[PDB]
Design a protein around this ligand. Structure first.
Ligand SMILES: CS(=O)(=O)Nc1ccccc1F
Lengths: 237, 300
């Protein structure tokens, strides 16, 4: 069934699983028309499909042309997401296909379940965790590849950079969700924390700066401060 | 006008015949039911006074044979039987009618209720849902499970309703996943009507049979089947106009006949609200929506 605090270490066992987040698939800017009405303009989107054990990110870029001439785009987006995840699974060798897929939003359950009827042994599960994967588009290199795409495209990343050389996948996931929660609560501040130092860079083949173990502890502390702050700045506390 | 005679009534029982019912006392001089209308299937059903648990009964059609009910003290229930000796049956039944030991099927002349509830129900199809080939009549009770319930356990004692499952490869064409899930017309018209049932009359007969087993025996899997068969039509954007009009009539009489106090267990809130207010056919069921809103506005 659903995934919660009680079964969190299950994410890091040796059963292949994938998180799927659809919150950046269908993206729009809302604007006024010359007649003073309102209209939307779609922008490129992405499916965020993540193996929490390995860090492997299957970033399927959703080009705006997929919406042309379509109705009820927010509903279509969930079904397009499920079509693309099903296509990804079928493209993987059998021994790489996931045993479970965990959707971050319950509205993805029926679309994914229907598209995966051919795979009755893949469990489709919700979660009670409020995961901050919507903030993936605050990662500069991911936002860049999405906005530059002129056609549908899948790009493969490791969202953990090289962290698994030094830490466990439980700790890597905890760092990732802390960084993403911060970027979601106050993007400018989070980004200042990460990138205000020039001596600590981002390697060409990485997403995040090349922090030493000690600097990660400092960084991680600064992100917790930010989150707790904004939580006061928000609720006045 | 045919007759279902009884050897005796050794145990106190409430007896149902179609939508009617009466109480028989222990060892009361009751010898059966007369004046049963020819041309319809019927159901004769039982609830013992000492164990309201297990309602049970028999679907039959007097055109198919001479049936009598005889209590079995070993198995502890009223059993339907067939008499092969037409002349013994006639002689025994005439005796009971002369001594006035039979209740009369009590149909009001104005009253089309039973016809309207069984319009498409045929014994031959009942006997395919309820498999016991040696008998011309079919036993059903409160506890019998359906083939689909069994897939989710004694196959001989099961209700073999047509399996309907909206998240199944039968229901969903590869490449039409969103289309077929959100608009079930393919599954209704091609898979079920053209492929399995052959025509809407057989579809409606199974729907009506499922409702009646839900109502008379509290058969839970029958209730599931009735609602699935409604929901499959309501969730199809493309339904023949004659089917929609007949469904409205069918459901109207079902809702009209439903005991007011069983609505909480016999009606699924989700299905009815979806069908009457959200579905493609939300505006196609005028009679049913009107009786539902005036009789069970709480459910909605
Ligand atoms: C007289 S009998 O019990 O042997 N058989 C029988 C036949 C028809 C109606 C009732 C009956 F009891």
């Amino acid at each position: 069934g659903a995934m919660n605090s009680s079964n969190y270490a299950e994410l890091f066992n040796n059963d292949i699983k994938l998180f799927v987040d659809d919150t950046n698939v269908y993206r729009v800017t809302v604007h006024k028309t010359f007649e003073g009405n309102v209209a939307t303009k779609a922008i490129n989107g992405c499916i965020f499909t993540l193996n929490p054990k390995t860090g492997h990110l299957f970033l399927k870029i959703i080009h705006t042309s997929v919406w042309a001439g379509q109705k009820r785009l927010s509903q279509l987006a969930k079904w397009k997401t499920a079509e693309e995840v099903s296509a990804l699974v079928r493209s993987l060798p059998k021994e790489e296909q996931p045993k479970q897929i965990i959707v971050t939003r319950k509205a993805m359950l029926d679309p994914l379940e229907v598209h995966m009827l051919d795979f009755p042994n893949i469990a489709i599960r919700p979660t009670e965790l409020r995961l901050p994967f919507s903030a993936a588009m605050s990662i500069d290199k991911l936002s860049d590849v999405v906005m530059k795409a002129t056609e549908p495209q899948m790009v493969l990343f490791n969202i953990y950079d090289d962290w698994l050389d030094r830490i466990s996948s439980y700790t890597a996931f905890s760092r990732l969700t802390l960084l993403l929660r911060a970027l979601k609560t106050n993007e400018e501040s989070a980004k200042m924390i990460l990138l205000s130092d020039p001596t600590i860079t981002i390697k060409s083949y990485h997403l995040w700066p090349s922090f030493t173990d000690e600097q990660w502890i400092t960084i991680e502390s600064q992100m917790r401060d930010l989150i707790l702050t904004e939580y006061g700045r928000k609720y006045n506390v | 006008m045919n007759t279902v005679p009884f050897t005796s009534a050794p145990i106190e029982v409430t007896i149902g015949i179609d939508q009617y019912s009466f109480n028989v006392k222990e060892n009361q001089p009751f010898h059966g039911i007369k004046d049963i209308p020819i041309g319809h299937v019927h159901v004769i059903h039982f609830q013992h006074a000492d164990n309201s648990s297990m309602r049970y009964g028999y679907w039959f059609d007097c055109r198919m044979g001479n049936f009598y009910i005889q209590y079995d003290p070993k198995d502890g229930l009223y059993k339907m039987m067939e008499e092969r000796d037409g002349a013994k049956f006639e002689n025994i039944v005439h005796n009971f009618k002369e001594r006035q030991m039979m209740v009369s099927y009590p149909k009001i002349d104005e009253d089309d209720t039973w016809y309207n509830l069984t319009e498409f129900v045929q014994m031959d199809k009942i006997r395919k849902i309820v498999r016991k080939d040696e008998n011309q009549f079919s036993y059903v009770d409160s506890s019998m499970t359906t083939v689909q319930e069994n897939e989710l356990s004694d196959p001989a004692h099961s209700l073999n309703y047509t399996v309907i499952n909206f998240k199944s490869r039968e229901a969903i064409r590869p490449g039409h996943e969103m289309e077929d899930f959100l608009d079930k017309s393919y599954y209704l018209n091609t898979v079920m009507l053209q492929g399995i049932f052959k025509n809407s009359s057989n579809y409606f007969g199974e729907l009506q049979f499922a409702f009646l087993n839900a109502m008379f025996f509290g058969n839970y899997g029958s209730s599931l089947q009735w609602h699935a068969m409604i929901e499959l039509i309501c969730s199809s954007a493309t339904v023949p106009k004659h089917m929609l009009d007949k469904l409205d009539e069918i459901l109207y009489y079902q809702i009209k006949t439903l005991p007011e106090q069983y609505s909480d267990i016999l009606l699924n809130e989700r299905v009815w609200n979806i069908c009457l207010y959200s579905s493609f056919q939300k505006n196609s069921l005028h009679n049913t929506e009107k009786i539902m809103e005036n009789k069970y506005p709480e459910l909605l």
